[PDB]
Amino acid sequence: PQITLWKRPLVTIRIGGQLKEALLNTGADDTVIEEMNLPGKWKPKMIGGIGGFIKVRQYDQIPVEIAGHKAIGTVLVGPTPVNIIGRNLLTQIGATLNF
Amino acid sequence: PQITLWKRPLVTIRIGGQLKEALLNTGADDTVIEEMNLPGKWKPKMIGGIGGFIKVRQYDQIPVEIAGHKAIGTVLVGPTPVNIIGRNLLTQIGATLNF
C-alpha cells in the first residue's frame, strides 16, 4: 500500500499476541513499543531521542506483523507515548520512501 | 527517487543558502535543524520526542530545497541530535511511504 504523510502514519501491528497501533518511522533506527509485559529474555539498552536517552529492554527475535506483513526481529520495550516501528522492521516489509 | 531503509535516509538540503545533511523522518510532525543562523524573526517554542522536550526557535515560511525538491514551511532550530525533515515538509515534496 501507499501511505501519505498528511497525518502520522499509524498502522495496526500484532506483537506478543496483541494488536496495537504503531508509527511507521523512517527516523528511528530501532523499534520501540510502549511498556508491555512481554515474556522472554532481554538485555538492557539505552536509546536516544530528540530530548535525550531512555532505558529500554531489548528483546530479540520477536515476531511482529505490520499491516498483515510478517516480520521478526529486535523489539525494544519502554515508556514511549507512541509505539514506533523502526528501520530494522521497515526493511523487512520492503518499505521505501518515494518522491 | 525511491529510497530503501537499510541505512538512515539522509539527504542533502539547502536552507538559508547553506548545505546540510538531514534525515527524512516520517516519525516527526515537525522539521528540526541543528543550531544555526536563519533570516527573519523566530518565536520560542518547545518540542518533544523520546527523551523529553527541548527548546527551539521557530522560524516560519522558510525555503528548504530537499534533494532537488522545493518546500517552504516551518523550521524549528535547536539542539537536535540530527537534522530532521518532518512531515510538514515531506508532504510538500510529495513524499509517501510504500510497501
Ligand SMILES: CC[C@H](C)[C@@H]1NC(=O)[C@@H](NC(=O)[C@@H]2Cc3ccc(cc3)OCCCCC(=O)N[C@@H](C(C)C)C(=O)N2)Cc2ccc(cc2)OCCCNC1=O
Ligand atoms: C525510537 C527513537 C529512535 C531510537 C531514535 N530516533 C528518534 O528519536 C527520532 N525521533 C522519533 O522517532 C520521534 C518519534 C515520536 C513520534 C511522536 C511522539 C514521540 C516520538 O509523540 C510525542 C512527540 C510528538 C512530536 C514529534 O513528532 N516529535 C518528533 C520530533 C523530531 C519533532 C520525534 O521526536 N519523533 C529522531 C532522531 C533522534 C536521534 C537520532 C536520530 C533520529 O540519533 C540518535 C541515535 C538513533 N536514535 C533513533 O533512531
